[PDB]
Amino acid sequence: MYKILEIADVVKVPPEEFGKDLKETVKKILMEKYEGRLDKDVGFVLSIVDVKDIGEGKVVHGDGSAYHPVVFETLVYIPEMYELIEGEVVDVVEFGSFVRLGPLDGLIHVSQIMDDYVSYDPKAIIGKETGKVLEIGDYVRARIVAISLKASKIALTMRQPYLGKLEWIEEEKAKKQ
Amino acid sequence: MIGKKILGERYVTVSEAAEIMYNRAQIGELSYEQGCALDYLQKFAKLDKEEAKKLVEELISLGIDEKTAVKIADILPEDLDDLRAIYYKRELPENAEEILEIVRKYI
């Protein structure tokens, strides 16, 4: 899932920046501090969208920086258990297929791709009885079955009804019409 | 932790997130992961931001929770089976058909 969060914080502005635009300076500091961070509860911080409020600066002894209370908005990516997702296969190995979900990828272990005997062809995952094939570039619909975010592993499966490579789903619809 | 406290949140569609990331890329170079996110978002956004947000609003007007409305807007289900995929371990909505009509209505 993707979310926009409203966050209250206190931003430290060094004296070397006192001549620059306050909002731009605060935004830059927030970007350097939080973008790229991965939090188990919050998710992956993708962007500091905007700074919505900046209070008066406070100065504490022994410190030359100005501490400003602020409220900023941020876009985050957060995987959720049992979530239905759609993504692109970016790597296929003998033990599974990696699927891009945004800034993070999920892994469909080789035994969770399809209900069939599969084999990895060094020269895509192929089903022996169905002929179904999964290779880099394919779009898939899957479900998250395991999450381990470390400030990482996201496990995916398509071995449930209504899941699979998009083309397989479209074919099923055609037959059922 | 991220900030002193999270005041509130809003689930957003992939379509809207894609435009938000597009704007971020206009103010500075993206990291590798931010770049992957932009690529993913642009490829899986099935509507522009305006339409996606309009769809979510319509679905919410029917009493559909925010998270689910967003997921529906992201997936754009075409039949009952697609809805069954979304409503995992959940009973299908009594308004299942109306949802499909609206989705098949982003038009």
Side-chain angles (χ1 to χ4, degrees), chain A residues 1-11 13-23 25-27 29-39 41-51 53-55 57 59-93 95-122 124-127 129-149 151-152 154-169 172 174-177, chain B residues 1-18 20-53 55-90 92-93 96-100 102-103 106-107:
Chain A
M1 301 295 280
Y2 285 83
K3 299 176 176 178
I4 276 295
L5 311 180
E6 300 305 307
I7 302 182
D9 194 15
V10 173
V11 176
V13 182
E16 293 67 42
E17 312 303 306
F18 289 171
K20 306 173 182 181
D21 181 83
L22 182 60
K23 182 175 177 181
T25 298
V26 168
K27 187 176 183 176
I29 294 176
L30 289 171
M31 287 166 62
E32 310 178 309
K33 181 175 185 177
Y34 299 128
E35 293 183 343
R37 282 199 182 188
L38 179 58
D39 186 298
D41 303 301
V42 178
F44 191 104
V45 179
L46 286 170
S47 166
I48 300 302
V49 188
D50 180 46
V51 182
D53 190 49
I54 301 176
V59 177
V60 297
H61 80 287
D63 203 317
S65 293
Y67 292 78
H68 295 82
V70 304
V71 171
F72 69 86
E73 176 169 291
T74 183
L75 173 70
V76 306
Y77 166 61
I78 178 63
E80 306 189 336
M81 276 298 291
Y82 308 126
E83 170 182 20
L84 180 73
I85 67 79
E86 296 197 317
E88 168 180 33
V89 176
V90 296
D91 188 24
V92 184
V93 291
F95 61 88
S97 65
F98 291 84
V99 180
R100 177 170 294 153
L101 308 173
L104 302 178
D105 306 311
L107 172 64
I108 306 174
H109 294 61
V110 65
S111 66
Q112 297 299 128
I113 295 179
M114 63 180 92
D115 178 53
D116 184 16
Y117 299 87
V118 301
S119 66
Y120 172 60
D121 186 304
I125 298 301
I126 305 177
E129 312 301 348
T130 62
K132 288 180 179 177
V133 178
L134 188 65
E135 61 201 316
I136 301 177
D138 294 340
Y139 281 13
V140 302
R141 179 193 292 174
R143 189 179 303 295
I144 294 177
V145 298
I147 302 177
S148 181
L149 307 178
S152 296
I154 298 178
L156 300 169
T157 186
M158 297 199 291
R159 289 196 68 171
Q160 292 182 8
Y162 319 138
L163 302 180
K165 175 176 178 177
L166 299 194
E167 283 90 319
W168 305 342
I169 296 175
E172 288 148 23
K175 292 177 176 177
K176 182 175 188 172
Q177 45 220 170
Chain B
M1 61 181 276
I2 307 300
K4 298 298 183 182
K5 178 186 177 180
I6 310 302
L7 301 184
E9 60 165 54
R10 172 171 72 85
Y11 280 97
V12 302
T13 59
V14 169
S15 295
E16 168 166 31
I20 295 177
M21 275 312 284
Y22 170 83
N23 297 326
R24 173 62 183 74
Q26 309 307 302
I27 69 174
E29 187 175 303
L30 302 183
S31 71
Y32 185 73
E33 290 180 302
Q34 287 178 308
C36 286
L38 181 63
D39 180 71
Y40 169 84
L41 293 171
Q42 302 186 315
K43 284 175 182 169
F44 289 80
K46 305 182 187 186
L47 300 168
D48 56 46
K49 193 187 74 175
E50 171 175 53
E51 293 302 294
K53 305 186 71 169
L55 171 52
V56 174
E57 285 189 56
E58 286 189 59
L59 296 173
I60 295 180
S61 300
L62 301 184
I64 300 178
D65 60 273
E66 176 178 292
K67 177 188 295 187
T68 303
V70 172
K71 182 59 63 176
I72 294 179
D74 287 342
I75 302 293
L76 293 189
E78 323 174 315
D79 55 32
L80 294 177
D81 286 337
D82 293 332
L83 284 178
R84 292 194 172 84
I86 296 177
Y87 286 77
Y88 183 64
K89 300 303 175 181
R90 295 176 59 183
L92 277 178
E97 287 305 309
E98 172 175 50
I99 298 179
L100 301 183
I102 299 180
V103 173
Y106 254 55
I107 2 267

